[PDB]
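sry for the spam today, last one i promise. C-alpha cells for design, 258 residues
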C-alpha cells in the first residue's frame, strides 16, 4: 500500500545493527563540486529499488569520517546518504547549512548514475552533528520540502528556528561542548508547538557519542527518517509510548504518532 515502504517489519535489535541492504560507497572529491567540500555517498546496492536521500554534516573541526558509521548504518536500512566534508573544518553552523543545501542540490541534479538510479530525489532529509546539527536546523527553516531533520548533540548561537519540517533532536547528558541546557533543549523548546518534534537525551553520553556506533542514535535516527522520508508508520512503535532506559530525558508534542 505504501510505495515507499522498504525492508521487513522492524524490531529494536535490528535497528542497532546494519540493516537489510548491502551498501556501496562513492567518494565525492572536493575538486568535483562547488558549494561544499565533497564527501562520501553511502547507497543501497544489490537492489533495483529507489530510496529517499539524506545529506549529513559533521561538526566543527571534523570531517565526514566522524559520521561514516551512521552514513553506512542509515544506507543499510534503505537510504542514499551523503556525508559531507566542509569547505573548511572551521566553518560555522550557518555555513554548514549552506553546504547541506549544496549537497542536496548535488544529489538531485549532479550525482553519479549509480546513485541517481537508487535515489528518489523527491524525498530528502538532513542530519548533522554539533555545528552540523545547527546547520540542519537552519536549512530546515529555509527548505520546507525537506521530509525531516535530525540534529545530533547540536550547537548553534541561534536558538530560535521556525520550521514545519519534523525535528528529532538527540542531546547528550554529559555534553560539555554543546550543553543540552544551552543548545539542544532551547532548540527543541523554541521550535513551533505545531511542528512534530521529539527531544531525547542520552544518559551519560558525551559530545562525541554521535561519532561512533551508538544504539540509541541508530534507533531514533533510523525511525525518524523511516517515518517521515518513507511515510513508514511501522516505525512509530519506536518513537511513541517510549520507555527507553538509555534515555535520561524525553520531550515531545506527540504529533508524529497519528
Ligand atoms: O561542532 C562541534 O563539535 C563544536 C562546536 C563548537 C565548539 C566550540 O568550542 O565553540 C567555540 C569555538 C568556535 C566558535 O565558532 C564560531 O563561533 C564560528 C561562527 C561562524 C563561523 C563562520 O563560518 O562564519 C565559524 C565559526 C567545538 C566543537
Ligand atoms: Ca532564529
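last one done:
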Amino acid at each position: 500500500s505504501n510505495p515507499y515502504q522498504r525492508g521487513p517489519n522492524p524490531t529494536r535489535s535490528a535497528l542497532t545493527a546494519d540493516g537489510p541492504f548491502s551498501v556501496a560507497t562513492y567518494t565525492v572529491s572536493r575538486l568535483s563540486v562547488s558549494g561544499f567540500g565533497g564527501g562520501v555517498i553511502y547507497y543501497p546496492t544489490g537492489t533495483s529499488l529507489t530510496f529517499g536521500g539524506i545529506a549529513m554534516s559533521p561538526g566543527y573541526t571534523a570531517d565526514a569520517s566522524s559520521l561514516a558509521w551512521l552514513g553506512r548504518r542509515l544506507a543499510s536500512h534503505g537510504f542514499v546518504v551523503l556525508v559531507i566534508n566542509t569547505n573548511s573544518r572551521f566553518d560555522g553552523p550557518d555555513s554548514r547549512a549552506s553546504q547541506l543545501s549544496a549537497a542536496l542540490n548535488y544529489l538531485r541534479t549532479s550525482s553519479p548514475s549509480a546513485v541517481r538510479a537508487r535515489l528518489d530525489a523527491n524525498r530528502l532529509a538532513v542530519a548533522g552533528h554539533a555545528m552540523g546539527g545547527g546547520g540542519t536546523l537552519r536549512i530546515a527553516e529555509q527548505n520546507p520540502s525537506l521530509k525531516a531533520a535530525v540534529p545530533l548533540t547540536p550547537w548553534h548561537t541561534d536558538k530560535t528556528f521556525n520550521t514545519s519540517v519534523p525535528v528529532l533532536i538527540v542531546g547528550a547528558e554529559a555534553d560539555t561542548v554543546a550543553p543540552v541546557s544551552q543548545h539542544a533543549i532551547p532548540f527543541y523548546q523554541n521550535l513551533p508547538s505545531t511542528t512534530p518534534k521529539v527531544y531525547v537525551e542520552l544518559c551519560n553520553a558525551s559530545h562525541i557519542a554521535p561519532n561512533s556506533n551508538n544504539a540509541a542514535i541508530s534507533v531514533y535516527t533510523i525511525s525518524w527518517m523511516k517515518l517521515w522520508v518513507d511515510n513508514d508508520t511501522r516505525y512509530r512503535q519506536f518513537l511513541c509510548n517510549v520507555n527507553d532506559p538509555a534515555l535520561c530525558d524525553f520531550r515531545t508534542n506527540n504529533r508524529h504518532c497519528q
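The radius of gyration is 16 Å. ok im logging off now
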